[PDB]
């Protein structure tokens, strides 16, 4: 049977944003395509290669846990970058997405060094960007979710799409997340994969093409996912007409 291996980095206490729903969503959508997903939880980043890895996932946690995960992930900072530059698919949520750049500035000005895989920084404020967020993307279709983060990420890379309602990476850009090659990062909660099946299928489809296994069938039933998106889309437009 076709098999895809997911490397869940820092599964042990980096699980604030549920994160098992992203694993559940990846496994269910791949199961509909007759693909068995093997999730390999990795907490020891010493001597681990990326040969048997098809997709990797890096969740988010508290500011203290992110620094501890950054130190452990730094032990393979170069082989991870070469995998991403080679086109390794990956999804990172919040802290895992913020700690891919150079540094993270807390509201008190304390700089915490990041992994440095990409050239960008994050500046946090007290007032958070909180509320429902609706995104219109060319690759991932309509992305719907909920944002709640104080850190403002500034990067000149490809984003997940334009923000029609909400804020996104910061107050002004009206762009959410990052999309560098096959690597994805976001601030969305829910999780993001359950409703946004087009993001799940993107990560699964890209891994299949790299491995050489069929991604069939490509179009499956998505009614439950679409009905969940429409609730927040209708609510976003209802509040949008008041502004």
């Amino acid at each position: 049977m076709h098999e895809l291996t997911i490397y869940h980095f820092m599964s042990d206490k980096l699980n604030l944003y549920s994160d098992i729903g992203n694993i559940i969503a990846l496994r269910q959508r791949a199961k509909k395509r007759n693909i068995k997903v093997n999730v390999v939880e990795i907490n020891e980043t010493e001597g681990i290669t990326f040969d048997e890895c098809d997709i990797f996932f890096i969740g988010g946690g508290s500011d203290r846990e992110q620094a501890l995960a950054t130190k452990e992930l730094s032990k393979i900072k170069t082989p991870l970058k070469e995998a991403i530059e080679d086109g390794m698919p990956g999804l990172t949520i919040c802290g895992g997405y913020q700690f891919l750049g150079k540094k993270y500035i807390t509201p008190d000005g304390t700089e915490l060094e990041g992994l440095g895989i990409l050239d960008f920084y994050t500046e946090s404020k007290t007032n958070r960007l909180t509320g429902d967020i609706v995104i219109e993307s060319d690759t991932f279709g309509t992305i719907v979710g909920f944002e709640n983060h104080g850190g403002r990420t500034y990067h000149d890379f490809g984003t997940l799409g334009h923000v029609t309602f909400g804020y996104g990476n910061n107050d002004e850009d009206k762009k959410e997340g990052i999309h560098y090659k096959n690597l994805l990062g976001t601030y969305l909660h829910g999780p993001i994969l359950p409703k946004n099946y087009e993001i799940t299928d993107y990560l699964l489809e890209k891994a299949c093409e790299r491995k050489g296994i069929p991604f069939e069938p490509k179009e499956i039933d998505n009614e439950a996912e679409i009905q969940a998106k429409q609730v927040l889309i209708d609510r976003a437009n209802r509040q949008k007409k008041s502004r």
Binding site: G21, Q28, G131, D132, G190, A228, V231
Partner: protein, 397 residues
């Protein structure tokens, strides 16, 4: 002043006191007496002090009321007993607060004993609580109720402190400990865990209380390990009131709570229950109640995202919805402002049962009366008020 004259018209007055379990015991006593068509005077949890009990007798005194069942705060005992004298008095337990002045319980027990001294009051004391059995020095007619050793394994070690003998001040030796200071104690000064007149031999909570009191089975409709002592204290009062074992068995098997916590409903052969869940832990607990129920089930799960509930519904993917595949379920009715999140959660949980989406909490709750199975209602906080009102509306016998 002239108010005590109302207390002389009633032949039997029952006081319920203690730190925990006053309301459950008082409701069990009053509900069983009302179910036997006995006219009684009964107060509530919000009126168990001097002014609250005084108002209770005025509003409810009729020439028919023969039994008075009222709960009272233990701090109000000296003030109340200056104007009221009851026939019997039951004490559930006494617990020191984590932050309670050293010996606060000992001084309080002594203050109650000097007030209830003599007065010929029938004291119904918990034999397993040493500070409750200390009150045996304030009367001559003492009735002990307790629980046999190894009758049940409680979640314990919440406080593992050492308690002193209320008679001599020495360290109490315990032969068996249920939890905290509740257990079988024996001090060589004479103070010991006395022999119990009414004793619970064994019980379990699956999903409700099933008690074995003096070789008799009681299938109740309330939950909680700690409610077993509160039900036995009610059993002791009712037995001393003349009710036989069968009359108490009828009232106990129909009483239930009224706050949406393991609350039970029944109309003809239709059975239903509601239990709030607002986090992954509470959800896994509410889903585990269904597996312990007999026959097919029909679910109503509500998920609002209001301010009191929080706007992040991510926690529903941390709960174990996949366990519903192990239960016989006719259909699952999802409701609330985020009902479609539940439907998507169940789809990803591979729960292959008919799912119905009805965003209105009232219309979705009333939809379960159309099914013959056991209804399991699981709302979050802001969904509890509309769901509980509809269940009370749909169950009127």
């Amino acid at each position: 002043d002239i108010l005590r004259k109302l207390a002389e018209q009633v032949d039997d007055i029952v006081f319920i006191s203690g730190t925990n379990g006053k309301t459950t015991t008082s409701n069990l006593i009053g509900h069983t007496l009302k179910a036997n068509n006995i006219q009684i005077i009964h107060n509530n949890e919000g009126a168990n002090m001097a002014a609250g009990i005084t108002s209770a007798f005025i509003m409810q005194s009729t020439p028919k009321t023969k039994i008075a069942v009222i709960e009272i705060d233990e701090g109000s005992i000296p003030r109340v007993l200056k104007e009221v004298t009851p026939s019997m008095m039951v004490f559930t337990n006494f617990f020191r607060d984590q932050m309670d002045r050293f010996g606060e319980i000992d001084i309080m027990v002594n203050n109650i004993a000097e007030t209830i001294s003599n007065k010929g009051i029938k004291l119904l004391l918990n034999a397993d609580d040493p500070f409750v059995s200390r009150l045996k020095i304030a009367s001559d007619t003492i009735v002990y109720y307790g629980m046999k050793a190894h009758a049940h394994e409680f979640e314990q070690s919440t406080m593992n402190e050492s308690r002193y003998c209320p008679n001599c001040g020495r360290l109490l030796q315990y032969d068996y400990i249920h939890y905290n200071q509740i257990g079988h104690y024996h001090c060589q000064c004479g103070f010991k865990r006395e022999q119990a007149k009414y004793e619970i031999s064994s019980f379990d909570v699956a999903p409700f209380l099933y008690l074995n009191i003096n070789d008799e089975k009681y299938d109740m409709k309330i939950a909680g390990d700690f409610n077993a002592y509160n039900a036995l204290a009610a059993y002791t009062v009712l037995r001393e009131l003349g009710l036989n074992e069968q009359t108490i068995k009828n009232g106990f098997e129909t009483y239930t709570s009224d706050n949406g916590r393991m609350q039970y409903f029944k109309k003809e052969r239709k059975e239903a229950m509601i239990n709030l869940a607002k986090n992954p832990a509470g959800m896994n607990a509410s889903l585990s109640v269904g597996e312990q129920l007999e026959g097919e089930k029909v679910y109503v799960i509500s998920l609002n995202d209001n301010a009191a509930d929080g706007r992040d519904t991510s926690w529903i993917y941390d709960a174990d919805f996949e366990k519903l595949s192990k239960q016989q379920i006719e259909a699952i009715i999802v409701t609330g402002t985020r009902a479609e999140e539940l439907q998507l959660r169940l789809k990803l949980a591979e729960v292959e049962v008919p799912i119905i989406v009805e965003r209105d909490i009232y219309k979705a709750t009333a939809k379960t009366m159309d099914y013959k199975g056991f209804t399991v209602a699981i709302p979050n906080y802001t969904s509890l008020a509309p769901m509980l009102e509809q269940l009370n509306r749909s169950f009127e016998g």
